[PDB]
Request: fold
Amino acid sequence: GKTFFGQPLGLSTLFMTEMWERFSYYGMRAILLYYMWFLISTGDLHITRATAASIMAIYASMVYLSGTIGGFVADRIIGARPAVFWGGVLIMLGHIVLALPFGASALFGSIILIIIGTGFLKPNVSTLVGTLYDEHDRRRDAGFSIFVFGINLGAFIAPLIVGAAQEAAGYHVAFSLAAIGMFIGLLVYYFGGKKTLDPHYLRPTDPLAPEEVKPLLVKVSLAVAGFIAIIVVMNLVGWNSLPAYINLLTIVAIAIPVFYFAWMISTSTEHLRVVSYIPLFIAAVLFWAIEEQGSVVLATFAAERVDSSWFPVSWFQSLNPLFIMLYTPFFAWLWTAWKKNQPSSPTKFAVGLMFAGLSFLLMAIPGALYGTSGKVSPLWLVGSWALVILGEMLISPVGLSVTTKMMSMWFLSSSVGSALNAQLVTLYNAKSEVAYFSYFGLGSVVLGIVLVFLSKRIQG
Ligand SMILES: CCCCCCC/C=C\CCCCCC(=O)OC[C@H](CO)O[C@@H](O)[C@H](O)COC(=O)CCCCC/C=C\CCCCCCC
Ligand SMILES: CCCCCCC/C=C/CCCCCC(=O)OC[C@@H](O)CO
Ligand SMILES: CCCCCCC/C=C\CCCCCC(=O)OC[C@@H](O)CO
Ligand SMILES: CCCCCCC/C=C\CCCCCC(=O)OC[C@@H](O)CO
Ligand SMILES: CCCCCCC/C=C\CCCCCC(=O)OC[C@@H](O)CO
Ligand SMILES: CCCCCCC/C=C\CCCCCC(=O)OC[C@@H](O)CO
Ligand SMILES: CCCCCCC/C=C\CCCCCC(=O)OC[C@@H](O)CO
Ligand SMILES: CCCCCCC/C=C\CCCCCC(=O)OC[C@@H](O)CO
Ligand SMILES: CCCCCCC/C=C\CCCCCC(=O)OC[C@@H](O)CO
Ligand SMILES: CCCCCCC/C=C\CCCCCC(=O)OC[C@@H](O)CO
Ligand SMILES: CCCCCCC/C=C\CCCCCC(=O)OC[C@@H](O)CO
Ligand SMILES: CCCCCCC/C=C\CCCCCC(=O)OC[C@@H](O)CO
Ligand SMILES: CCCCCCC/C=C\CCCCCC(=O)OC[C@@H](O)CO
Ligand SMILES: CCCCCCC/C=C\CCCCCC(=O)OC[C@@H](O)CO
Ligand SMILES: CCCCCCC/C=C\CCCCCC(=O)OC[C@@H](O)CO
Ligand SMILES: CCCCCCC/C=C\CCCCCC(=O)OC[C@@H](O)CO
Ligand SMILES: CCCCCCC/C=C\CCCCCC(=O)OC[C@@H](O)CO
Ligand SMILES: CCCCCCC/C=C\CCCCCC(=O)OC[C@@H](O)CO
Ligand SMILES: CCCCCCC/C=C\CCCCCC(=O)OC[C@@H](O)CO
Reply:
């Protein structure tokens, strides 16, 4: 019968929904840093470029952190299908805000809308993909990989289209194209979903029992009052600059996994089978930090150290999803052409971190060889993204499987690694380039070597 690459036809609806949301997301992040540079250059935004780079990292950290709770809100309160829709509406409003004739005053409102909207949408679109298959259907893994291909496709064409529009018609038009991309996703999702999506998911599947409402409200109210209390204390003692608020979000983002690990210890049955995952969680954090610096540090390098006079420099951001799409069929082959081998997940995470470290070590070569005052070939960045995505092909598909032996924890390692970036990327500039690349690249390599050592002990 009529299928979508052998899958239920409803997959095409969710395929396009996420392809256009990712288009709106990565099209925005391909030019947002340069947009802040521009506002700084005109005197409208009064921050350093180091702070702007820090804003990009904590922005990503909050988006992934917001995705850790969006599944709960849909499953218990509003439903998975309304969560995707209203999440898409909030994302669209987030980009419209940047298309309005405002300046730096609109940056915070746009960031908040997209953080909340992406938290509602991203975890619950993947959830809706699963609802196309029951628990016995073997097509589940094939349908998700096709779904992932739509993710990378939108992430691939967005910097090309949006980056070109910025260079031709300016930032406001470019951001409006991101808003239009999400709008297209809303049209296809709304009318397409009504035809093929199970109406059971218009409502929460585990709605709150009557006695559960109050303790949740107490739990939410205590968290907001405490967070607001901290901001009050900060302004009393003088810690009220934008870097101080970024440091607050950094501490909050890192304190979540460490508190969820400190009292997770207190049953020797898996007392140490949970300590097992910690050398792997720290490995995932450091890999995601390197990977998410491509839109910050490597975006800075592309704009300042690469002779890219004949094409928009935001196009470099397409190399990340391009290498993902090129690598995946080879690794799908490898993970079943090598049935006999299938090396251990702790070794996969160890080697994956070493490739990420090799991507930065490679970036230290041109500055050490030619100096940092000139311009170098774009192929240096191509080789860097080739190496780091090779590290992703190891840790990303096996990643959720290690901790199970929830994607929120893998939303979480991305948030912590991106929160770590909010501190580190302020260290990057033309004078620190070689030392920044060489030492964070070397440190990432040796931490992949100690993990290979520890890998024998971890498997138990
Ligand atoms: C069948 C698939 C095999 C793919 C594996 C090979 C990787 C692909 C291409 C490697 C090309 C090597 C670099 C070429 C080179 O040396 O540049 C020559 C060029 C002359 O016009 O000159 C230079 O001007 C350049 O400025 C000099 O600087 C360098 O070349 C330093 C290069 C950085 C080191 C890279 C060396 C080896 C990378 C191999 C990676 C393989 C990993 C596969 C998992
Ligand atoms: C999607 C971004 C990847 C771009 C990769 C481009 C690969 C280019 C390799 C050759 C190095 C740049 C050559 C510069 C060049 O030829 O310019 C033409 C001439 O007008 C001098 O500017
Ligand atoms: C006005 C500014 C508000 C911005 C909203 C951003 C909200 C971001 C995050 C809030 C959720 C934090 C709690 C996340 C959490 O603890 O879940 C982790 C857990 O699921 C691990 O599996
Ligand atoms: C109108 C206010 C903004 C939109 C409301 C949604 C704001 C995001 C989160 C509010 C807290 C909801 C409860 C989240 C929660 O308890 O997460 C628990 C965590 O274990 C999830 O698995
Ligand atoms: C700025 C935009 C304001 C909001 C415009 C859209 C509101 C118009 C009608 C409400 C539609 C709500 C549909 C919620 C929903 O669950 O949709 C799921 C989708 O699969 C269709 O069932
Ligand atoms: C429980 C709450 C967890 C904390 C979530 C709060 C995250 C809220 C906002 C993060 C935005 C990052 C900073 C935005 C920013 O700096 O832009 C404004 C700046 O350009 C104005 O000069
Ligand atoms: C379909 C409903 C949501 C999608 C967004 C709809 C509005 C998008 C674009 C309308 C025009 C965008 C504004 C362009 C603009 O004003 O910037 C250009 C000009 O101000 C600078 O010279
Ligand atoms: C200044 C530019 C306009 C700013 C407001 C843009 C809002 C325009 C349209 C709202 C689109 C709602 C989502 C699109 C959609 O498919 O909704 C269908 C649903 O509402 C039908 O019941
Ligand atoms: C930051 C501001 C957030 C404002 C909205 C956050 C609300 C968080 C917790 C309160 C949830 C109460 C929802 C009650 C509900 O819908 O269920 C009622 C019913 O199912 C019980 O029988
Ligand atoms: C539950 C216990 C509450 C105790 C306080 C918890 C939060 C403690 C410290 C938060 C500090 C925010 C980040 C530090 C900071 O503001 O740095 C300031 C510095 O960069 C110059 O302003
Ligand atoms: C999440 C619970 C409600 C919290 C209400 C208070 C939220 C206030 C700040 C959240 C963090 C964003 C801080 C970014 C910021 O405001 O920078 C302003 C900048 O001008 C510093 O002077
Ligand atoms: C008993 C609980 C386990 C032991 C406590 C572990 C510490 C818990 C939370 C601290 C989060 C790490 C500090 C965040 C960080 O490294 O950045 C600091 C920087 O932003 C301040 O300028
Ligand atoms: C071939 C694939 C992996 C690529 C990484 C291989 C290169 C490994 C390390 C290169 C970094 C060399 C750093 C040299 C250096 O820092 O010198 C310092 C001085 O020359 C610059 O200030
Ligand atoms: C198989 C990987 C190919 C070789 C990778 C090893 C690359 C090691 C260093 C990068 C080239 C070194 C550039 C020369 C250098 O750093 O010296 C500069 C300094 O001595 C001048 O004062
Ligand atoms: C799996 C792929 C590993 C990548 C290997 C690392 C290769 C990285 C950089 C090679 C730099 C060669 C650039 C020389 C070049 O062709 O352009 C000449 C330049 O002067 C034009 O601007
Ligand atoms: C098990 C949880 C994983 C925790 C991974 C994060 C590691 C903990 C703290 C990292 C602190 C990074 C501090 C960066 C730093 O101080 O240098 C940058 C600073 O100059 C920014 O102004
Ligand atoms: C020599 C240390 C053990 C080697 C472990 C293998 C690590 C992979 C490639 C070698 C990386 C060499 C990095 C050289 C380096 O960091 O120099 C720092 C430079 O800034 C000082 O000249
Ligand atoms: C064990 C968990 C590792 C997570 C954190 C790893 C890095 C932690 C702190 C780094 C801050 C110290 C910065 C060292 C440094 O000088 O780098 C800057 C240099 O390369 C350029 O000047
Ligand atoms: C300056 C030298 C650069 C090249 C050295 C890098 C390779 C050297 C040693 C790597 C293997 C060290 C031993 C690791 C090992 O086999 O531990 C056993 C482990 O597999 C059991 O889980």
About this structure: Residues 1-460 form one domain. Residues 92, 96, 99, 101, 170, 172-173, 176, 179-180, 183 surround 78M (ligand 7) (CB under 6 Å).
